[PDB]
Design a binder for this molecule. Structure first.
Ligand SMILES: OC[C@H]1O[C@H](O[C@H]2[C@H](O)[C@@H](O)[C@@H](O)O[C@@H]2CO)[C@H](O)[C@@H](O)[C@@H]1O
Ligand code: ZN
Ligand code: ZN
Ligand code: ZN
Ligand code: ZN
Length: 384
């Protein structure tokens, strides 16, 4: 799809791709270089597949956790911003896009899940997961439910699993121990057991996905949802009176969402590396550029200091950051994709009733360290 005369960009379908296309149009007007923005299905899995052939976009947008795996496989080009450009973005966002001492992507925004609630149905949202089932029963009288969120992606269920002690890989000294996974412990089991019990008792449905949960919240059928900043735009249109707040506690402990830094990497096999840098540094990562994307779908807490200062006054962004503080920045190590696959499988299988919580997470513990063999291709063509 890529050619020396134009830019191809991949970004997830829940992000402000229309706003990004607007920045692309501005870039075209100035340079004659046409920018194509695509939102492929499961693009985070598609990229490492197509890039091996010599295909793939010029620029890929995803949360930072996937980028280490890409970098390890030599699929990304090393980015080279000067001293002056680095100072315009928050230092911790640069750390999220650092792999083996090298910058491997441009950071765009910090993302964290929050509790989103209907203020008319629920003037005071629950501080506690434990109190949600009773609230759900209470709301049935009015023909409503308490809570609906995406049960198909482990990103959304992870904050509850992590609350009482679930973790990805053990972080000691400065490195991650890829053998010490923490999805098998009593805390992680307690969290998933609570969720499965909600499902079994019909407080939630195992089949609920992103679109179902969104439709239900935005039409005022459910009092609460769990989602990121990107979701606020469609809620704004719905005229549901909504608030954004701290996620509920579990066993007196905060929910711990995995924090993502939306990042832009340059394909190593791109003929347009220079134009890619030019677009990202001088068009996207500006007040005007981020505004265009943000006005489409909210980015969260943007990496660009000057624009973040303008946005920080938003109470919804303050809540995002409060949840972010209580969560953990995702690791970016290559094993993260195996982790996500293992947890994804564990949640779906436990939620459907195919496996017990105990058995589901036992198998997930293995796959987060053993299913590395399927991932470790070492290039289908060419060597290490
Ligand atoms: O569900 C596992 C999945 O979680 C994260 O993906 C998030 C992404 O960070 C957000 O920007 C948003 O698009 O929702 C996604 C979940 O559907 C990880 O970044 C991703 O690697 C992982 O597979
Ligand atoms: Zn489009
Ligand atoms: Zn009950
Ligand atoms: Zn406990
Ligand atoms: Zn220039």
């Amino acid at each position: 799809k890529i050619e020396e005369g134009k830019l191809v960009i991949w970004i997830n379908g829940d992000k402000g791709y229309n706003g990004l296309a607007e920045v692309g149009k501005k870039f075209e007007k100035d340079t004659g270089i046409k920018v194509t923005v695509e939102h492929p299905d499961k693009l985070e899995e598609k990229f490492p597949q197509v890039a091996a052939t010599g295909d793939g976009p010029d620029i890929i947008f995803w949360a930072h956790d996937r980028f280490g795996g890409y970098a390890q496989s030599g699929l990304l080009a090393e980015i080279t911003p000067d001293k002056a450009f680095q100072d315009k973005l928050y230092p911790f966002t640069w750390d999220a896009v650092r792999y083996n001492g090298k910058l491997i992507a441009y950071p765009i925004a910090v993302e964290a899940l929050s509790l989103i609630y209907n203020k008319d149905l629920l003037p005071n949202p629950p501080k506690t997961w434990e109190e949600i089932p009773a609230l759900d029963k209470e709301l049935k009288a009015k023909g409503k439910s308490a809570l609906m969120f995406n049960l198909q992606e482990p990103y959304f269920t992870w904050p509850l699993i992590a609350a009482d002690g679930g973790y990805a890989f053990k972080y000691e000294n400065g490195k991650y121990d890829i053998k010490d996974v923490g999805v098998d412990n009593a805390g992680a089991k307690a969290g998933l057991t609570f969720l499965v019990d909600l499902i079994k008792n019909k407080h939630m449905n195992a089949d609920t996905d992103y679109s179902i949960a969104e439709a239900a919240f935005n039409k005022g059928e459910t009092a609460m949802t769990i989602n990121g900043p990107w979701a606020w735009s469609n809620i704004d249109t719905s005229k549901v009176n909504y608030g954004v707040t701290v996620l509920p506690t579990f066993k007196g402990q905060p929910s711990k969402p995995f924090v993502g830094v939306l990042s832009a990497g340059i394909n190593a096999a791109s003929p347009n590396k220079e134009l890619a840098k030019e677009f990202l540094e001088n068009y996207l990562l500006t007040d005007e550029g981020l505004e265009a994307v943000n006005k489409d779908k909210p980015l969260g807490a943007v990496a660009l200091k000057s624009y973040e200062e303008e946005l920080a006054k938003d109470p919804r962004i303050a809540a995002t950051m409060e949840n972010a503080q209580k969560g953990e920045i995702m690791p970016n190590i290559p094993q993260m994709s195996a982790f996500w696959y293992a947890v994804r499988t564990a949640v779906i299988n436990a939620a459907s009733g195919r496996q017990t919580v105990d058995e589901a997470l036992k198998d997930a513990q293995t796959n987060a360290a053993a299913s590395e063999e399927l991932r470790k291709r070492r290039e289908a063509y060419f060597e290490k």
